[PDB]
Structure 1
Amino acid sequence: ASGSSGMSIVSLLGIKVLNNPAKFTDPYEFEITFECLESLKHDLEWKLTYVGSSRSLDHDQELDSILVGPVPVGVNKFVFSADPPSAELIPASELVSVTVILLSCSYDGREFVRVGYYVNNEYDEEELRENPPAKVQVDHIVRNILAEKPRVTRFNIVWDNENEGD
């Protein structure tokens, strides 16, 4: 606060959710468009996170992370590909039709943006949608990212120069 190095170099302009509504075991594909005002020393870091009610382990599941090279000054486009979650960590008696994914970008380790998305999951069969199992048949689950209602959150991180010590 006593150092609102506000001036934000990168600003998210849009996230196309192509690939949706693929299968629960299908990777996540995002077409993120953003602009970079000045040049940056370091790389931008992207990450997807699975958030979902559970009675033990299902939330805070980081799905994946990646560091993007040199960010060209101007309006850029980057396609994010995130691995699906291991069934090893989703309710066994699951029927968690609604969960959340948080896509966020950071810089030099300081997070500066986060996009919240609600997801819809349901088995792909009539009776199994009328008389479910007691064991989550993962590969019969079809997620549906509600790509239309995204919640955005900008933070105020310090970027490059600040004159580390003075």
Structure 2
Amino acid sequence: MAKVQVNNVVVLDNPSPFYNPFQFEITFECIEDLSEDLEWKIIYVGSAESEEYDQVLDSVLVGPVPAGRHMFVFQADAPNPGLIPDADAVGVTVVLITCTYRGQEFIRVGYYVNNEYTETELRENPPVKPDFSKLQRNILASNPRVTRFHINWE
């Protein structure tokens, strides 16, 4: 029986242009006090082909947690457009948010990312190479995929 569970996650700043940093709001419930600091990660899958184009955004630690429920807001920087292959630079992809405790991952949440040209002529026929000044990022918050793992806590 897991102790810490997420109760609601709400995405902020959507839709928005490509260069805006990511915003999230996470609340979670706790049964009994935790001994060590928590850890969170955000992973952006640059290319749908394989995992060689993964860009890590940021990783933070959460202070000591007493019993009860808490809320906080997570912020991370924009991804580097230079490392993304030009084939995957338009279409759909996946953004991963994961949590680790005592060096063990125990819950993963992911979203579908919609990257499309705002100008309809570029959406009907896009340019030969990207223009990141005209792209817009959309996150499908209506269908969040989650998966939880059983780990050791004591």
Give the TM-score of the pair, scaled to structure 1: 0.84
User: Which amino acid is the alignment partner of residue 114 of structure 1?
Assistant: R
Deviation at 1:149, TM superposition (A): 0.4
Q: What percent identity do the matched residue pairs reach? A: 57
Q: Say whether the 8 Å CA contact 1:53–1:96 is kept in structure 2.
A: no
From 10, 31, 45, the equivalent of 1:37 is 31
For residue 104 of structure 1, report the CA deviation from its aligned partner: 1.0
Q: Distance in 1 between matches of 2:145 and 2:130?
A: 29
Contact 2:48 2:88 in 1 (8 A): no
1:101 pairs, out of 81, 95, 100, with 95
Task: Give the AA of the match of 1:24.
Answer: F
Deviation at 1:101, TM superposition (A): 0.6
**What is the aligned partner in structure 2 of residue 115 from structure 1?**
109
Secondary structure of the structure 2 residue equivalent to 1:128: helix
Give the stretch that moved more between structures: 109-118 or 133-142: 133-142
Query: Is residue 128 of structure 1 aligned with residue 122 of structure 2?
Result: yes
Which amino acid counterpart does residue 101 of structure 1 have in structure 2? V
Structure 1: which 4+ aligned runs deviate by more than 4 Å? Answer: 54-57
Tell me how far 1:80 sits from its aligned partner. 0.9
The one of 30, 37, 48 equivalent to 1:53 is 48
Q: Structure 2: give runs of 5+ residues left out of the alignment.
A: none
Match of 1:14 in 2: 8
Larger Rg: 1
Could you tell me which of 134, 141, 148 is aligned with 1:147?
A: 141
Specify the alignment match of 2:82 in structure 1: 88
Aligned-residue RMSD, C-alpha: 1.8
Distance 1:126 1:148, change over 3 A: same
Structure ranking higher in strand proportion: 2
- TM-score (structure 2 length as normaliser): 0.90
Amino acid of the structure 2 residue aligned with 1:105: C
| In 1, Cα distance between equivalents of 2:67 and 2:116 | 42
Instruction: After superposition, give the CA deviation of every residue in 1:1-33 in whole Å (9 maximum; x if it has no partner).
Output: xxxxxx322101111001112222111111111
Unpaired runs of 5+ residues, structure 1, are 1-6, 162-166
What is the number of residues matched between the two proteins?
153
SS at match of 1:16: strand
Task: Say whether the 8 Å CA contact 1:103–1:114 is kept in structure 2.
Answer: yes
Between the aligned partners of 1:114 and 1:133, the Cα distance in structure 2 is: 35
Q: List per-residue Cα deviations over 1:62-117 (Å, max 9, x = no partner).
A: 22211111123211101111222100221224443100011111111101111121
